Amino acid sequence: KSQSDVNKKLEQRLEEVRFWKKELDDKLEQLVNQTDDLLTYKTRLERSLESYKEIHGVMNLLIRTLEESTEQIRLNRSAKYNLEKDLRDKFTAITIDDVCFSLNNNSPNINFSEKVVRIEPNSVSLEDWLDFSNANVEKADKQLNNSTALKTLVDQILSQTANDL
């Protein structure tokens, strides 16, 4: 009976971690697409900047807009790096725990432990774990909102100035 129960709780952990990693993957790929689009808009901007050498306010305004664009993309891929490290460590955990699952009463290379029967410092609890994951994910989502708004914004400003001239 005891052996079977251990089996069960192992599969429980497997499944839950898998679900969370899939969530992570989805959000990261969405952010990747958005960063691509923002960089394209940066290109369009600098094109217009160099074109207008051929009134003066627009030059300063467009330089400053490029500045805020730089700050935005900055924030975006900072968040991207955070999410990526989280993802890699989650997978690192999952593969090892599955390896631990695979074992049976006859697999080889089975031995004794020496001293593990205690609780080590630098350990955490379930709700803290969940809050860590949740915080990182929601930060990424806020950044996505950032990117969408600024895309719309840049399109508005460019069309406005173009029609003005």
């Binding site: 790929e29 990747v32 990526e84 593969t95 695979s102 006859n106 697999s107 080889p108």
Partner: protein, 49 residues
């Protein structure tokens, strides 16, 4: 002889499940991924039986 068979099938199963682990991670990639790298060269590379 029983013990002999046990050891043989055991090592077979171990290497094989490791192989499945590998190919799981092999599939577990998707366009615009993280592990991407500008390695070069290893296209005309093989030593297989």
């Amino acid at each position: 002889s029983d013990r002999s068979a046990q050891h043989e099938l055991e090592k077979d199963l171990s290497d094989k499940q490791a192989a499945l682990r590998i190919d799981d991670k092999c599939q577990h990639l998707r366009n615009t991924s993280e592990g991407v790298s500008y390695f070069r060269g290893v296209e005309r590379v093989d030593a297989t039986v």
